[PDB]
Design a protein around this nucleic acid. Structure first.
Ligand SMILES: [Mg+2]
Ligand SMILES: [Mg+2]
Ligand SMILES: [Mg+2]
Ligand SMILES: [Mg+2]
Ligand SMILES: [Mg+2]
Ligand SMILES: [Mg+2]
Ligand SMILES: [Mg+2]
Ligand SMILES: [Mg+2]
Ligand SMILES: [Mg+2]
Ligand SMILES: [Mg+2]
Ligand SMILES: [Mg+2]
Ligand SMILES: [Mg+2]
Ligand SMILES: [Mg+2]
Ligand SMILES: [Mg+2]
Ligand SMILES: [Mg+2]
Ligand SMILES: [Mg+2]
Ligand SMILES: [Mg+2]
Ligand SMILES: [Mg+2]
Ligand SMILES: [Mg+2]
Ligand SMILES: [Mg+2]
Ligand SMILES: [Mg+2]
Ligand SMILES: [Mg+2]
Ligand SMILES: [Mg+2]
Ligand SMILES: [Mg+2]
Ligand SMILES: [Mg+2]
Ligand SMILES: [Mg+2]
Lengths: 129, 104, 66, 88, 271, 70
RNA sequence: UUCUUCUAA
RNA sequence: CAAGCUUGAGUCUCGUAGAGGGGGGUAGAAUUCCAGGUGUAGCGGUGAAAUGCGUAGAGAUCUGGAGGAAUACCGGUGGCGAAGGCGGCCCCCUGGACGAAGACUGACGCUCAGGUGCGAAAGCGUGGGGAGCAAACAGGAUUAGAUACCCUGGUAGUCCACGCCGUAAACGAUGUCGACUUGGAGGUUGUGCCCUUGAGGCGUGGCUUCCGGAGCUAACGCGUUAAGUCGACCGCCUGGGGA
């Protein structure tokens, strides 16, 4: 079954990058837009777009630099079988600060760097590197 | 009810008693409020191989729309009669009415 | 080059012997689908019709038995 | 399986709208009719193990439908098993 | 239904009852009873002719229709009863005109079925008709040897006889022993196997259960003195001689049929 | 293979015609197949190896059709 | 048709 | 926790395919046995032989009868089933899958310790049956020996009913469920469309076989039916023996 939609989003990005697909579509969600909000803002995808009314489809426009893929690595950290919550002191540095860790905090979903500047931690959704 | 296709093979020396058998069988079906769609005597016909040490038989085709209880009564009539040699009942999806390719 | 696909019959009739004699050999064996090119849906229907015509002494089981 | 008239006689009996045909009480009673119709088959054919797997599939499916119905609406759950004569 | 007894005592350790709940739990039909006085295996000379018979429970005789002559008149089966006189259960039948009789109960017969003798009878388990009217290859019981004499073949609890052939005046039978015998085609026979087929699954369990059936104990011949039996004698266990009867006739293998009157009726012997 | 000698036919023609129908009806290979018992393991294995023989040789013949040898 | 075996560094 | 929504899951309608199961029939061919006719000195077997069968008439051949078991050709890296497994034909009862359009219920789902059920062959118990085959056993050969391979026989067994056993290299040596990721040649089974102007042309589902790209892997290879990329849950592994 679809036990985890968020890991389905990351896997369709990861298989999308490796297959040199231009765009990747998927069923939309309130959480999947906020993750694609971070990935467009932090610069990993070009643009996202949600279309449809009854069943909304989130479409991700992928990003390619110098032929090869922009998103080098993308991993799920907290998963339904094993949740990961961190405090604001123990937030991770992905790729020594070059990558980002999408963290779900009380003030919405943001990156780990903005989570430290906001001064509060939360649940680590994914590592994007 | 349940569309059956019945063909039976009569001993050829009992070829005279064949229309007496058919009218009882039709009265068995129509008496049980069943339909009979086509009813085609094929006459004496040379067998492909001698069943029961004899070389000819009398064929009768009969298509029947009856409930399944009276056909099981009808099968025992074929079993204990010695005039009929072989009997074959075949369940059919629908009622067929067109003439046989050998009635032609 | 299946004939039954061209003419389009829903079920082969075992009583049609002159059709079925074009699908048995001289010694009464069922001719394979490699040779006549029958599509395998009708090949199951044809074998089921030859086996019924053998039972009603419309076709021989072999050319030898007597 | 169940005959066409016997299905529609159940659907119009237990459907709220006489065309719903997939409501929870409708799906239970169609299984309960098919389970109770097959009591005579496996009393006669005890070595028909391949058909009995299809029977246990109906029992296991019906048990999940009642258990869904219990926490969804209790008053329909009491009314259904009392009318269908189900021990639990 | 065979019922293994629970071992509450030795002597109930090995008992298997044959429990049939369809048998009538009451007294038998009183006009069809008569006295069956015991014999003890002793003839009009008072001597013991056949050994090991004696004692046992008192038994009333049930008059059983073997001749089966009420032709054309249908009969419904009232109830099934226990018969101490024989291994097969008997059926109390009621004709339309009001006569009650006992027949041997066939295999699938139950209370409420209709049976009918005569030539125009149907072919269901229970009917009785001459074997020129019965199809070849069917299993019949209660078979006559002579026409109108009464049924004599295949009467014990689970037996039956197949009709294998017919050549005019005779039919050829496959008896239950495996012997092939010719019988005239006018002899009556009753369709179906006879009823109590699970009779041979009983085990009596204890020594007294054979004394209930009037079977006195059998002293084996080598346990005697030489004046008593040819096997008797010896200082210890000695048996240096061929096995014979108490009257000196070979038993392990020697044939004893000496009927030259009926040899034309026997097609093949048993195997 | 019930073969009647036609009118004004030489014997070597009809014998060669008789060898033809026996190879056609498959008589010699049928009795040789039934001379000994073949297990359902052996029957499923030999029929499977016969299919791979009919398939990889088709691919080997088509691959050898393309490239030259001298 | 049958047709076996050969240690030491 | 409350209220939903329809994509997951399910129900209904109409169809299709199938060695899917259970029960009862039935047919043809062959084998052996029995009887008889013709017939006369071999037969059978092997590497070669012998045991064996034969003048008391075998083998061969023809007619008749009995009985059991399995179902040539079709037949196919074909089909069905959860697995084991399933093969003449007919009927009765019966499970599942799939398709086409809708209708409907509204997360009802996935997995699963313990548990329960099914589970090849061999074996066991009771009762039948017993043609062929065949452990055991016997005889003949072979050999240095031959408790073997070969031969001639042959009993449990194989078959049926009902119980038990609960194991196999029970294998795809690959747990189930879901999502995504370039292709090619097929098989099978639906269904839509084009004038079917032919068995064609264009699609769209299920199942399946082969090759192979990226990727993976110790390599062999796997490769949209993953052993690729991930998620959920379970089972399991920790040097070889001893075991
Ligand atoms: Mg259903
Ligand atoms: Mg005695
Ligand atoms: Mg004794
Ligand atoms: Mg004693
Ligand atoms: Mg003494
Ligand atoms: Mg003496
Ligand atoms: Mg002594
Ligand atoms: Mg001594
Ligand atoms: Mg040595
Ligand atoms: Mg909707
Ligand atoms: Mg709704
Ligand atoms: Mg499961
Ligand atoms: Mg077994
Ligand atoms: Mg043993
Ligand atoms: Mg046994
Ligand atoms: Mg036994
Ligand atoms: Mg034997
Ligand atoms: Mg041997
Ligand atoms: Mg194991
Ligand atoms: Mg297997
Ligand atoms: Mg395999
Ligand atoms: Mg394994
Ligand atoms: Mg490959
Ligand atoms: Mg890996
Ligand atoms: Mg995988
Ligand atoms: Mg691996």
């Amino acid at each position: 079954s679809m036990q985890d939609p968020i890991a389905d989003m990351l896997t369709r990005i990861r298989n999308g990058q490796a297959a040199n697909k231009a765009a990747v579509t998927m069923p939309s969600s309130k959480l999947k837009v906020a993750i694609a909000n971070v990935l467009k803002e932090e610069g990993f995808i070009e643009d996202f777009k949600v279309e449809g009314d009854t069943k909304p489809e989130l479409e991700l426009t992928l990003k390619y630099f110098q032929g090869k893929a922009v998103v080098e690595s993308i991993q799920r950290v907290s998963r339904p079988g094993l949740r990961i919550y961190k405090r604001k002191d123990e937030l991770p540095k992905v790729m020594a600060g070059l990558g980002i860790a999408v963290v779900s905090t009380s003030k919405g979903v943001m990156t780990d760097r903005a989570a430290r500047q906001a001064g509060l931690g939360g649940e680590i959704i994914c590592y994007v590197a | 009810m349940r569309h059956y296709e019945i063909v039976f093979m009569v001993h050829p020396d009992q070829s005279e008693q064949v229309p007496g058998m058919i009218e009882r069988y039709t009265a068995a079906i129509t008496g049980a409020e069943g339909k009979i769609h086509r009813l085609e005597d094929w006459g004496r016909r040379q067998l492909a191989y001698p069943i029961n040490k004899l070389h000819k038989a009398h064929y009768v085709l009969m298509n029947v729309e009856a409930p399944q209880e009276v056909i099981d009564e009808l099968e025992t009539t074929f079993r204990f009669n010695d005039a009929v040699i072989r009997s074959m009942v075949m369940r059919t999806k629908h009622a067929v009415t067109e003439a046989s390719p050998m009635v032609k | 080059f299946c004939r039954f696909t061209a003419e389009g019959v829903q079920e082969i009739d075992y009583k049609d012997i002159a059709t079925l004699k074009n699908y048995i050999t001289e010694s009464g064996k069922i001719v394979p689908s490699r040779i006549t090119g029958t599509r395998a849906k009708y090949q199951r229907q044809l074998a089921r019709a030859i086996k019924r015509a053998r039972y009603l002494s419309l076709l021989p089981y072999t050319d030898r038995h007597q | 399986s169940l005959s066409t008239e016997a299905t529609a006689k159940i659907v119009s009996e237990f459907g709220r709208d006489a065309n719903d045909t997939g409501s929870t009480e409708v799906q239970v009673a169609l299984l309960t009719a098919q389970i109770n119709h097959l009591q005579g088959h496996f009393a006669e054919h005890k070595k028909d193990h391949h058909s009995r797997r299809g029977l246990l599939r109906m029992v296991s499916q019906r048990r999940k439908l009642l258990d869904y119905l219990k926490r969804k609406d209790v008053a329909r759950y009491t009314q259904l098993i009392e009318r269908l004569g189900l021990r639990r | 239904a065979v019922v293994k007894c629970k071992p509450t005592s030795p002597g109930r350790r090995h008992v298997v009852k044959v429990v049939n709940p369809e048998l009538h739990k009451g007294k038998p039909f009183a006009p069809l009873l008569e006295k069956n006085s015991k014999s003890g295996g002793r003839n009009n000379n008072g001597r013991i002719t056949t050994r090991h018979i004696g004692g046992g429970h008192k038994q009333a005789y049930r008059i059983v229709d073997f001749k089966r002559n009420k032709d054309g008149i249908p009969a419904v089966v009232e109830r099934l009863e226990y018969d101490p006189n024989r291994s097969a259960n008997i059926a109390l039948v009621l004709y339309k005109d009001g006569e009650r009789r006992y027949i041997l109960a066939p295999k699938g017969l139950k209370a409420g079925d209709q049976i009918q003798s005569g030539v125009d009878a149907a072919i269901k388990p229970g009917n009785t008709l001459p074997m020129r009217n019965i199809p070849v290859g069917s299993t019949v019981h209660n078979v006559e040897m002579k026409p109108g004499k009464g049924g004599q073949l295949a009467r014990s609890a689970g037996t039956y006889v197949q009709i294998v052939a017919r050549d005019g005046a005779y039919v050829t039978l496959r008896l239950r022993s495996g012997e092939m015998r010719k019988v005239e085609a006018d002899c009556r026979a009753t369709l179906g196997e006879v009823g109590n087929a699970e009779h041979m699954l009983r085990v009596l369990g204890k020594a007294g259960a054979a004394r209930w059936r009037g079977v006195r104990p059998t002293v084996r011949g080598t346990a005697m003195n030489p004046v008593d039996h040819p096997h008797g004698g010896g200082e210890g266990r000695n048996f240096g001689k061929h096995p014979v009867t108490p009257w000196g006739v070979q038993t392990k293998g020697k044939k004893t049929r000496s009927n030259k009157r009926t040899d034309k009726f026997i097609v093949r012997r048993r195997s | 293979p019930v073969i009647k000698v036609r009118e004004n036919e030489p014997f070597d023609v009809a014998l060669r015609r008789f060898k033809r129908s026996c190879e056609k009806a498959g008589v010699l290979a049928e009795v040789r197949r039934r001379e000994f018992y073949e297990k359902p393991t052996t029957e499923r294995k030999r029929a499977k190896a016969s299919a791979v023989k009919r398939h990889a040789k088709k691919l080997a013949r088509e691959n050898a059709r393309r490239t030259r040898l001298y």
